[PDB]
Design a protein around this nucleic acid. Structure first.
Length: 99
DNA sequence: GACGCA
C-alpha cells in the first residue's frame, strides 16, 4: 500500500523465501513510537530480498532481515533519518546478537 | 537506541 511520506520509495518487491539465509540485518529506531508490522514490511520490502521485519515489544526498536547486502544498504541510504507515516526512522547495520 | 508479548 502507499506510504505517507515524501521520500521517493521503490515499488513493492516480493519477499525472499522464508528459509533464505540472512546476509544482512538492520537495526531500526522509531521516534516517537513503532510503526505497524504490516506497514514496516511494506516499507522494507521495496528494497528487494526482504526476509522479514520484526519488533521488540515494549521498546522503540525493530529489525529487518535481508537476503542481500545491496538491498539492505539501499534501505539504509533511502530511509535513515526520514519520516514515514509520521515516524522518524534511524536505520543502520545491526550489531550481531552474539560473539 | 539493542535483541522477537499478550
Amino acid at each position: 500500500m502507499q506510504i505517507q511520506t515524501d521520500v521517493v520509495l521503490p515499488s513493492c518487491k516480493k519477499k525472499a523465501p522464508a528459509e533464505t539465509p540472512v546476509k544482512e540485518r538492520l537495526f531500526i529506531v522509531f521516534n516517537p513510537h513503532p510503526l505497524p508490522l504490516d506497514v514496516l514490511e511494506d516499507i522494507f520490502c521495496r528494497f528487494g530480498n526482504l526476509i522479514e521485519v520484526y519488533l521488540v515489544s515494549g521498546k522503540n526498536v525493530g529489525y529487518a532481515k535481508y537476503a542481500d547486502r545491496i538491498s539492505a544498504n539501499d534501505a539504509i541510504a533511502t530511509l535513515h533519518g526520514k519520516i514515514l507515516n509520521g515516524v522518524r526512522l534511524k536505520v543502520m547495520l545491526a550489531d550481531s546478537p552474539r560473539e
